[PDB]
Design a protein around this nucleic acid. Structure first.
Lengths: 153, 124, 260, 188
RNA sequence: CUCUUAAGGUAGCCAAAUGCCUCGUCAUCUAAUUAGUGACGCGCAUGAAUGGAUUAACGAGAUUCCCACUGUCCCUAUCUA
RNA sequence: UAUCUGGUUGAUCCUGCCAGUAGUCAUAUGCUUGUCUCAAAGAUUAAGCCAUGCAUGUCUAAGUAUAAGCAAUUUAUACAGUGAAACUGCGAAUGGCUCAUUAAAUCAGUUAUCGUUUAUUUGAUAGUUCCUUUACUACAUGGUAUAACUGUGGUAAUUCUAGAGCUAAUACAUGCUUAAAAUCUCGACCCUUUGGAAGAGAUGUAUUUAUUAGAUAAAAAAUCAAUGUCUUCGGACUCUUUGAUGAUUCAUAAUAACUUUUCGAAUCGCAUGGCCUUGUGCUGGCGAUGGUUCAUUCAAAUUUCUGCCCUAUCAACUUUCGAUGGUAGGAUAGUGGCCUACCAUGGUUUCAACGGGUAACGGGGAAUAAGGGUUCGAUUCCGGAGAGGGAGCCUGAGAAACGGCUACC
RNA sequence: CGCGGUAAUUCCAGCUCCAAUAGCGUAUAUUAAAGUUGUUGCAGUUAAAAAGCUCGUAGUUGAACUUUGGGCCCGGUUGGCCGGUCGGAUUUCCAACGGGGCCUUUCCUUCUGGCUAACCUUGAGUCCUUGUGGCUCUUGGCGAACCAGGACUUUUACUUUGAAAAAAUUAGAGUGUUCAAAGCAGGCGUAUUGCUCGAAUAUAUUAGCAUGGAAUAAUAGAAUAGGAC
RNA sequence: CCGCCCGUCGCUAGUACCGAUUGAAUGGCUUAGUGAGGCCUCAGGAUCUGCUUAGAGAAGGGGGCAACUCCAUCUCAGAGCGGAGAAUUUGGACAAACUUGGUCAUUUAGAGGAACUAAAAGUCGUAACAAGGUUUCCGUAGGUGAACCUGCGGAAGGAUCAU
RNA sequence: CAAUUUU
C-alpha cells in the first residue's frame, strides 16, 4: 500500500535505536539494519539494500519466526500490505472410508521486498500477532510457474 | 469421593428365549448334576464363550508374535492348571473343542463324589 | 482460575508413584519444586510406599521434624519436599544411605548405597550464560547455581558437583561414544551409550540409543542424560541393570530363577 | 472496568460472538493520563505481581542529547508544537511519545560555548591544556545552530510520558530537522 | 309430489345509506358506550348491467378511535386598536 | 454368542409393515422377601424459594505482651514460663457444589512466549548508604500512634460505635559508619612543556532514556597524513578479547545524565566460648525471619494448527455504534482494532458464510456387538462457566472473589 | 391374529402343569434383530419410486507409455540332515526364503575444514614358521566410516517404523479376596531380633512429529531456447 | 353376481387450520432518549500538624546595683516554608436500572367460519369390478342433489399382438 | 334396442 520514497505519512519512519552520526560523512551513506532469519532460510538480496522501514517486516523489522510453518497459494494481492492465501487439504472420515476436501484459508502479512500475484506457490511462518486476524509472515516466494521471463509476443 | 468400584455381571441368557430341545438338554445336564438354577450353568457357559471369544482372535494371529506365543501358552498353561484340560492337549485349538461337564468335573460338588466320599451329588 | 490449585487427588497422579485406589483420596501434593516438574517424589509417599517404614501420616510427620532424614547434606525440614534426579538421601544411625535411580520400566528402585560416592550429584546443565556483575553463571538439575564455572563446558552436559559448596569438580563432554542414561519416554533408562545423533534443527533433536541387547531406538534430546563414557559408570548400578529384557523371557527366567 | 480481550467485537467473517465470560481483572486497561505541563503533580498506582507505574501529569523537566553520544543535559520543557497522530494535543499542551517540544535550549549553547567557548555566532592554564586539546571539533551544522540565535530550539520525545512518570527525549538531528521543518512549516 | 296466472332467490351480501319487532344476539374497544367494529340470517321488504361482490391512488363527501395540541371546559383574568 | 417367528388369500410366491424376542450403570412402578461382600442416590421439570444448626483460621525456642490471670521457680529483681486477648505476619482466590448460558466458542491433541508477570520451595547473590562527601551528631541504638485494658455512653435491636488515660514492635517513619585497592572527568601549583603533578572529587544497585561494543576465507605488503616499546633507529613490527541461539537491538559491560528515590537489619532463641593488649579491648558459633537480581517449580495469561449435531419452508453476511488493514499515540504485565486521530476499501461464502433450533457444559467414557455401527455421556477424572439477576469495585502475588463490598431490579 | 352368542381347550374360579426363582411382571426412551436406511449391504417394468427432454459452472470420475531383464559376491532368519547326542545337539549343505553392495551404457546431490584411514602410499626393519599372514615411523598417496557449514533438492496423497496419545474404566500376564464380582498384592527362612519377587503387557482413531519405499493418484520445467553443466 | 363397492344428506365424538381484537406475555438483539452507583480526574480544605518565633502575658537569668533581649512559661503573635487530610466538587469512561420504537423467535386467549376422520344402522340412486350393460384411464375447460356427464389431445393398465 | 336393486 505504498511506493514513492517510502517515507509517506504523518510521522517520520525510522528504525529504533539506530544512529548514523551526521558529523561523520563517509562514502557508504548507509546505516540500515538487517538480520538473519533462522530455519535455514536465506535472507533475500533486496532486504539488504532496501528502503522500506515498516516494523512488521519479517527481516528488517521486529518479528522472530518461531511457530508452526505452513505452505499455501495466493488468492489475492488486492489486499493492501497483507495477503490472504488458500490452503487445500484432504480430510479422511472413518464412517464412509472415503476422503473429503474441506479447506481453511489464511491471511498473512508480507514483506514489501516481495511482489506476488494470484497463484504463486508460497510458504509462510508463524509469528507474534501483527494484527487481529493475521499471525503469519512470508519467508520466501519461489513462484516457479511457467515462463520465468520467457515470452516474446 | 472414593474410587468407583468396578463390577460386572457374569451371565448372558440365550437369544431364542425357550424351546424344547434347548430346555431338555438343560434339565438332563443340570439335573443329574442337580444344580441350583440357570444362573450358574449360564455363568460357566458365559466365561466359556468369552475365552473362546478371546482365543479365536489370537488364533487369527500367527505364531512368533508376542500374544499367540506369550499369553497363548499361558491360558493353555492355565487350562492345564485349573485341572480342566488334560495333559495331552497343548495344541492351541483343542481349547476350542472342550465344552460342558469339563468345567463341571473340577468343581467341588462333582469331584467329591468322584472320590467316593459323598454317596450322591445331592448329599454332596 | 483465581489462584494456584494446591489440592490434587489420586487417580490424577504421576502413576510411577504406584498408589492404589481403595485408600484413593486427595493425593500427597508436592511442595514448590526445587528442581523440575511433577515427575518428582515427595517424602511422605516414599516412606510408606516402597521403603515401608512409615505407617501413619502423623508418624512420618513425626520423623522429618526432628532433623532425622537428610537430603543433599541439608534436612529440608518441611513435609512434602520433592526429589530430583539421582538425589542422594543421607540417613541416620544404622546408616542406610540411599539413592534414587529409575528402573527399566520407569519405576524407581529399592536402592541403598554407601557413604563412598555419596558426596556428589550429576546435574543436567541446560542454561549457561553470563549475568550481571560480569559473572558467567551456570545452572544445574536442582537449580543449584554455581558461580565462575570452567568456561566452555558446553550446553547440555552433566557435571560432578560438591553439594557442600557449589564447586563443580569434573565435567564431561557429549559426543559420539559416551554412556547415556535417558529419562522420559516409554523406554526410559536402559543405556544407549551412543549409536548416532543428528540435527533435526528447531523442532527437537534425536539421539539413537542401543543397549547390550543391541536393539536401537530413538529418543528426543531433552530426555537423554549421560553418566559417563563407554564402560564408565559413575554410580552404584542397580540390580535390574538397565536392560528391559523382553516380556516372555522375564516370565521364562522367573520360571527358572525361582529354582524349580 | 474496560476490557481488552476479543470476547466482544464481531469476528473476521462478520459473525457476532454471543459473549460468555463477563470481564475479569487480569485483562484490565484503565483510563488514560493525557499529560499536562505545570511542575510535578504525579501519583502512583500499584499493580500486577507487585509493581509500580507512575501516573504523570504536569511534568516540568527532561533531558536531551546531541545525539552524537548522549550527553543528557538537565532541561526544563516549555510547550507543545506538533504531533503526528492528531491535532488533539497542540492546543491542549499534552506531550506524548514521538511528539515535538520546544524545551529551552539555553544551557546547551551555554555548555557548548563554555566547555568549548568558540564562540559562534549570533585564558587560564587549563583551557590551554584541555580545551586546546579538543581543537578542530566544534564544526557541527548550520540549521542545527541557526536556531541557536533567538534562544530556543526544538526537541522530540522518545520516552513514555504517562506510564514511567518520566520524559526523556532528544533534540532532532540532520535530515529529521529537514523533515519536520517541512511538516509544520507549510502553513502561512 | 303439489297448487297461483310462467319459474320460484342461484353465486354473493347484511341490522349495511335498505331490519318497524330493535337499544336483535355474541366477542372486542372504554370505569361506563342506544355510537363503533368483526361475526351470525327464514332478510316486515337484500341480490345480479333496475348490475352483485371486491379493490391500490384520490376526495372542501359521511363516520368512530388513537397520538401529539390547546382558554372548548374547570375558571376566569388582562391588555391593545 | 454372524441366527428369527404369528398376521394381507379358498389355497400360493412376494414387496411390505404391525406384533412377538433379547440386552440396557435406563428410569419409575406392582407383588414378594432368608443370607454375606462392597455403594448410585433431588441431573430429568422449577440454575425456583429457603426456617434453622454448622461449614476457615492460626503460635514456635526463634515478632509485640507489667492479664491489675494461674505461674511459682531459683537469679532469670527490667524480664524471659503457660500465656487470655489484641496488633503484626500468612490463609480465606484452594477445596465442595451445580450445568444456567455456551455451535470454531469452550474442549481433545498439538505448538509457541526472541510477546509476558510471580506469592512462596530451592540455588546463589550487595564493606562503597556518608552530598553537613568533615556542628554527619546516637547507632555501645531515635521519633510518634496507637490496641487489648481502665473508667464514662447512647439506641430497641446489628460483629453499632464516641469523647477521655497511659501504652508497644520484624507496625509506620527516619537514620551513620564497616577493610581495601583501583579506573576516570577536573585541576593547588610552577614552567613553560611529549607539560608534569598536588588534590575537587564521581566511582553499590534499581528507574528512565541517548550511545557504543558484542569478531571472523586465501595470506602477506606498497603509497601518503600524525607517525613509536628498544633504538644498530632507512631498523624486529602492531600485541588484542566473543557467551549463546536455527534467529536477534539478546545476556552483559561502559559511557552522559535523571529519579517525591527502590534496595542494602534500630529483630528474637540456645550455648556461653577463644585470646591477653583483663577492658562494653577484641574476636565470638548455630538458628528463626526479612530484602536486590537471576534462574527452577507452583502458576497465570495469551497462542498456531485440525476436529464441532439439525435446517436452505435462512442466499448473501458485514462497515459512520470497528467491518478488514496500515501508520502514530495510549493502556496493559504483556503483542494486537484492545480504544482513539488520519488514510485506504476490504474480509467470509454452495468445500454451506450468515441466521434459527438444541429437553446442546466439551473430552477421556458408557450401553449395545460377526465386520462396518447406532444412541448416549448433567454426574466419582481433566478443563470451562456460575454463587437470584446484571453492573462496578478497594485490599492482596494471585479475586471482577460472592461463607468480600457498593448501587439498581 | 382372535376368543364369548347355552358344555369358552382363550372369561372367573378349583385342581394339574409350564416358566423363570430371591427375584419376578408392567410402562417409557433406546441398540441388536432391520440388508425396514444400506459405505461394507437396499429398491426404482407391473408391488413406493427413473426428472418430459436437452444444455450447463460446480463437485465427483477420467485411454495408454516414460528402467526392464539380469549375472556375481556377502552375511541374516525358520524347517530338515546318517542326526553326532540323553523335547537341548546341528558344525556342513538342502529347501523356503528375504536384505545389502557391485558389473550390467547406469544418480553413484555439490563441495569447504580437522578427524578422516588405508596402502596403492611407502626406507624397508622384520623383533616372527609364510617377510604389511604377526607390527613400526610412513610424501603428490581413497579424501571424509563425523561432526558443523555453504548449498537448495517440483509439491503432495499413501504406507513401514519410532515418539506422542493424563490416569481409572475395556482388554491381558501374574496372584487360592475360602470361591467369585473384586483388590494389587504377596510368597517363604531359624521363627535365635529375615530373605525376596512384584505391582506386567496391549489398544488407544483422525491432526501433527521425525523415519524408508517410489508401484499406485496427481503434479513441472528445454520451443522463440531469455535452456544445462 | 341373491356378490362386492361408490359418493351427497341426517345424526354421535374428536383432530388440527384461518380468524376482528391498529390481540397479549416472555426472550433475543437492537431504535432514540433518561441516568443510579463505584471509579480516574480538576478543584476543595473544613481539622490535625511540623522547623522558626521579634515581644510578653509567665518570671528567672551570659552574673550580678539593673550588669545581656537568653534557659523560665502558655499563644497573643509575623506568618516564611510546608505536609497529612473529611465532607463537598468540575470533567471523562464503565455503565446497573428505566422509557419509546422496530425486527425476530417462543408460547397463548379469542365470538365464528371451512374442512377431515371414525362407527355401521340409514335415505336417494348405481356411476366402478364382466365389454358393469355408454370400453376405460390421464391432463385440461364447462355444467352438474349425488356418485357423475360432456368437449378436446393422449394412452392400453383392453375388448384386437393378424390382412 | 327397456334394465335398476337385492342387508
Amino acid at each position: 500500500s505504498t511506493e514513492l520514497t517510502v517515507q509517506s505519512e504523518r510521522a517520520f519512519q525510522k528504525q529504533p535505536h539506530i544512529f548514523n552520526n551526521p558529523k561523520v560523512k563517509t562514502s557508504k551513506r548507509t546505516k540500515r539494519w538487517y538480520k538473519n532469519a533462522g530455519l535455514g532460510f536465506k535472507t533475500p538480496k533486496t532486504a539488504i539494500e532496501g528502503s522500506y522501514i515498516d516494523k512488521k517486516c519479517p527481516f528488517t523489522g521486529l518479528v522472530s519466526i518461531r511457530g508452526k510453518i505452513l505452505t499455501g497459494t495466493v488468492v489475492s494481492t488486492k489486499m493492501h500490505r497483507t495477503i490472504v492465501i488458500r490452503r487445500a487439504y484432504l480430510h479422511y472420515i472413518p464412517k464412509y472410508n472415503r476422503y473429503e476436501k474441506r479447506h481453511k484459508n489464511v491471511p498473512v502479512h508480507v514483506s514489501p521486498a516481495f511482489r506476488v500475484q494470484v497463484g504463486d506457490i508460497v510458504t509462510v511462518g508463524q509469528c507474534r500477532p501483527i494484527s487481529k486476524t493475521v499471525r503469519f509472515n512470508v519467508v520466501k516466494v519461489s513462484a516457479a510457474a511457467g515462463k520465468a521471463n520467457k515470452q516474446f509476443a | 469421593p472414593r474410587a468407583p468400584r468396578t463390577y460386572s455381571k457374569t451371565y448372558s441368557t440365550p437369544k431364542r428365549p425357550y424351546e424344547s430341545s434347548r430346555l431338555d438338554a438343560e434339565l438332563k445336564l443340570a439335573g443329574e448334576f442337580g444344580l441350583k438354577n440357570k444362573k450358574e450353568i449360564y455363568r460357566i457357559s458365559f466365561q466359556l464363550s468369552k475365552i473362546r471369544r478371546a482365543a479365536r482372535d489370537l488364533l487369527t494371529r500367527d505364531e512368533k508374535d508376542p500374544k499367540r506365543l506369550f499369553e497363548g501358552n499361558a491360558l493353555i498353561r492355565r487350562l492345564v492348571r485349573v485341572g480342566v484340560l488334560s495333559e495331552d492337549k497343548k495344541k492351541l485349538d483343542y481349547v476350542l473343542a472342550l465344552k460342558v461337564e469339563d468345567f463341571l468335573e473340577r468343581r467341588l460338588q462333582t469331584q467329591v463324589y468322584k472320590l467316593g466320599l459323598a454317596k450322591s451329588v445331592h448329599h454332596a | 482460575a483465581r489462584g494456584p490449585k494446591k489440592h490434587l487427588k489420586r487417580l490424577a497422579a504421576p502413576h510411577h508413584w504406584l498408589l492404589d485406589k481403595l485408600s484413593g483420596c486427595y493425593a500427597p501434593r508436592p511442595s514448590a519444586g526445587p528442581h523440575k516438574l511433577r515427575e518428582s517424589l515427595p517424602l511422605i509417599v516414599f516412606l510408606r510406599n516402597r521403603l515401608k517404614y512409615a505407617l501413619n501420616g502423623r508418624e512420618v510427620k513425626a520423623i522429618l521434624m526432628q532433623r532425622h532424614v537428610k537430603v543433599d547434606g541439608k534436612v529440608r525440614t518441611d513435609t512434602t519436599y520433592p526429589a530430583g534426579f539421582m538425589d542422594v538421601i543421607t540417613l541416620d544411625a544404622t546408616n542406610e544411605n540411599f539413592r534414587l535411580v529409575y528402573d527399566v520400566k520407569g519405576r524407581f528402585a529399592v536402592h541403598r548405597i554407601t557413604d563412598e560416592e555419596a558426596s556428589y550429584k550429576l546435574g543436567k546443565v541446560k542454561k549457561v550464560q553470563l549475568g550481571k556483575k560480569g559473572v558467567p553463571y551456570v545452572v544445574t538439575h536442582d537449580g543449584r547455581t554455581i558461580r565462575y564455572p570452567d568456561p566452555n563446558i558446553k550446553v547440555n552436559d552433566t557435571v560432578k558437583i560438591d553439594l557442600a559448596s557449589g564447586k563443580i569438580t569434573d565435567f564431561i563432554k557429549f559426543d559420539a561414544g559416551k554412556l547415556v542414561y535417558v529419562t522420559g519416554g516409554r523406554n526410559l533408562g536402559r543405556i544407549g551409550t551412543i549409536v548416532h545423533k543428528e540435527r533435526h534443527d528447531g523442532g527437537f533433536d534425536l539421539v539413537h540409543i542401543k543397549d547390550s541387547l543391541d536393539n536401537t531406538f530413538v529418543t528426543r534430546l531433552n530426555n537423554v542424560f549421560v553418566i559417563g563414557e563407554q564402560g564408565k559408570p559413575y554410580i552404584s548400578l542397580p540390580k535390574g541393570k538397565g536392560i528391559k529384557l523382553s516380556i516372555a523371557e522375564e516370565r521364562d527366567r522367573r520360571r527358572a530363577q525361582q529354582g524349580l | 472496568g474496560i476490557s481488552r480481550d476479543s470476547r466482544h467485537k464481531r469476528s473476521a467473517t462478520g459473525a457476532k460472538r454471543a459473549q460468555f465470560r463477563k470481564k475479569r481483572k487480569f485483562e484490565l486497561g484503565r483510563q488514560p493520563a493525557n499529560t499536562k505541563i505545570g511542575a510535578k503533580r504525579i501519583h502512583s498506582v500499584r499493580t500486577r505481581g507487585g509493581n509500580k507505574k507512575y501516573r504523570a501529569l504536569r511534568i516540568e523537566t527532561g533531558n536531551f542529547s546531541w545525539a552524537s553520544e548522549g550527553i543528557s543535559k538537565k532541561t526544563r520543557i516549555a510547550g507543545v508544537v506538533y504531533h503526528p497522530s492528531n491535532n488533539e494535543l497542540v492546543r491542549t499542551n499534552t506531550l506524548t511519545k514521538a511528539a515535538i517540544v520546544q524545551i529551552d535550549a539555553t544551557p546547551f549553547r551555554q555548555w557548548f560555548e563554555a566547555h568549548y567557548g568558540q564562540t559562534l555566532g549570533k585564558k587560564s592554564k587549563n583551557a590551554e591544556r584541555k580545551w586546546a586539546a579538543r581543537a578542530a571539533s566544534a564544526k557541527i551544522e548550520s540549521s542545527v545552530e541557526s536556531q541557536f540565535s533567538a534562544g530556543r530550539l526544538y526537541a522530540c520525545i522518545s520516552s513514555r510520558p504517562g506510564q514511567s512518570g518520566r520524559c526523556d527525549g532528544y533534540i532532532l538531528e540532520g535530515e529529521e530537522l529537514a523533515f519536520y521543518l517541512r511538516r509544520l512549516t507549510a502553513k502561512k
